[PDB]
């Protein structure tokens, strides 16, 4: 027995890889702010050692602290929120060139937003300020600490 990848509690550490990430100009479930997104992203729970592809996860069954993730259906598309404590730390894969989030001056906390098709097609979104790592496609690795349930 082991805790599955669809099971999160506050204080968990999430490792995400975003191969061939595209730069989105304005993300709907971010307040119309830039983001990087990848079609074949991978999610890892560092403490437990479990990992799975983002596109292979039933995101309506992912639970944080035993409760379902917050969802926002901007346009006709449903985006699932995975809250974080602190900011999302993302950098170019294999290199020490680090990206910075949109709220690089605020004490706000970021989140991992996932669009899920309902079948097997999921996009992982990371908030960004500009094309500090490039226009894309660019391999990006992220790091964050799972935050509390937004109530």
């Amino acid at each position, epitope marked *: 027995p082991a805790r599955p990848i669809t099971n999160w509690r506050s204080g968990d550490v999430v490792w995400v890889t975003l191969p061939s990430a*595209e*730069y989105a*100009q304005s993300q709907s479930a971010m307040g119309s702010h830039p983001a990087y997104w990848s079609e074949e992203a991978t999610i890892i729970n560092v403490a437990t050692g479990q990992r799975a592809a983002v596109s292979s996860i039933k995101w309506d069954q992912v639970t944080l602290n035993g409760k379902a993730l917050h969802k926002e259906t901007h346009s006709g598309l449903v985006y699932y929120q995975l809250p974080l404590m602190g900011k999302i730390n993302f950098w170019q894969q294999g290199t020490t060139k680090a990206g910075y989030t949109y709220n690089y001056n605020t004490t706000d906390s970021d989140s991992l937003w996932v669009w899920w098709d309902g079948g097997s097609k999921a996009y992982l979104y990371i908030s960004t300020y*500009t*094309t*500090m790592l*490039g*226009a894309g496609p*660019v391999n990006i690795t992220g790091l964050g600490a799972v935050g509390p349930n937004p109530v």
Partner: antibody, heavy 130, light 108 residues
Framework: QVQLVQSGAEVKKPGASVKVSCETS????????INWVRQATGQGLEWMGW????????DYAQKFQGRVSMTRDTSISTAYMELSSLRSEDTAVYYC????????????????????????WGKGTTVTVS | VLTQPPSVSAAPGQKVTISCSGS????????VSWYQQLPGTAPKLLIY???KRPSGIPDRFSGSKSGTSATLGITGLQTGDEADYYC???????????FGGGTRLTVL
């Protein structure tokens, strides 16, 4: 795959205006800026301006501001360019391109870490004036 | 604005480089893409970002940005390399898309 099919060659008198078309296919038209690049025969490339095909927002170079109008037709997925007051130095090949990257440009709004390149190009439209 | 050699020649099997040079607001602050234009053809994306290759571009092509100057590299020259190469970067003071003068890559 994604394609950018333009119109045929145009011959115009000096003083008329030329409209150049660019049909889009293979991708969501209202998702990337449509770029226009001029190349005079014997001269290098030169950016003419982009246009966001979802709000009509456009940004011309500070040489054609007042002689160029870039419109859009999202129903048929066609981008347009109009060039009025055709001078003698307007005989050139006009290219349609799809740009990828930051689309926010101002004199002092984002003076660092701006990446934007033209991914897929058209085939060119030879517009001659005489 | 972005300077560029008017012409560049090399042996049919020799590495050769094409280098631009801009100001702080051109290359020291932004990313520089490269474009290839065969005679009688539309320009084709050769290098995006600073050193990234699109799908289809052979690995012999490479690029690098060091200071306010960026260069285009080749590993081995072939017959089909005879084209014109252009710089492209972001100008925060002039225009989001600026080009160089171009360079003709011939054979010796």
């Amino acid at each position: 795959q994604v394609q950018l099919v333009q119109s045929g060659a145009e011959v115009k008198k000096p003083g008329a205006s030329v409209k150049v078309s660019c049909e889009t296919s293979g991708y969501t038209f209202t998702s990337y800026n449509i770029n226009w690049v001029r190349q005079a025969t014997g001269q290098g490339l030169e950016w003419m301006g982009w246009m966001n095909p979802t709000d009509g927002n456009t940004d011309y170079a500070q040489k054609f501001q007042g002689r160029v109008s870039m419109t859009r037709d999202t129903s048929i997925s066609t981008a347009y360019m109009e060039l009025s007051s055709l001078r003698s130095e307007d005989t050139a090949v006009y290219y349609c391109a799809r740009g990828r990257g930051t689309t926010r440009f101002s004199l002092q709004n984002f003076p660092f870490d701006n990446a934007y390149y033209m991914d897929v190009w058209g085939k060119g439209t030879t517009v001659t004036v005489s | 604005v972005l300077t560029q050699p008017p012409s560049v020649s090399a042996a049919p099997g020799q590495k050769v480089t094409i280098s631009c040079s801009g100001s702080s607001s051109n290359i020291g602050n932004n990313y520089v893409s490269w474009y290839q234009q065969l005679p009688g053809t539309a320009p084709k994306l050769l290098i995006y970002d600073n050193n990234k290759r699109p799908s289809g571009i052979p690995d012999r092509f490479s690029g690098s940005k060091s200071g306010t100057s960026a260069t285009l590299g080749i590993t081995g020259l072939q017959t089909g390399d005879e084209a014109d190469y252009y710089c492209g970067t972001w100008d925060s003071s002039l225009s989001p898309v600026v080009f160089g003068g171009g360079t003709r890559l011939t054979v010796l």
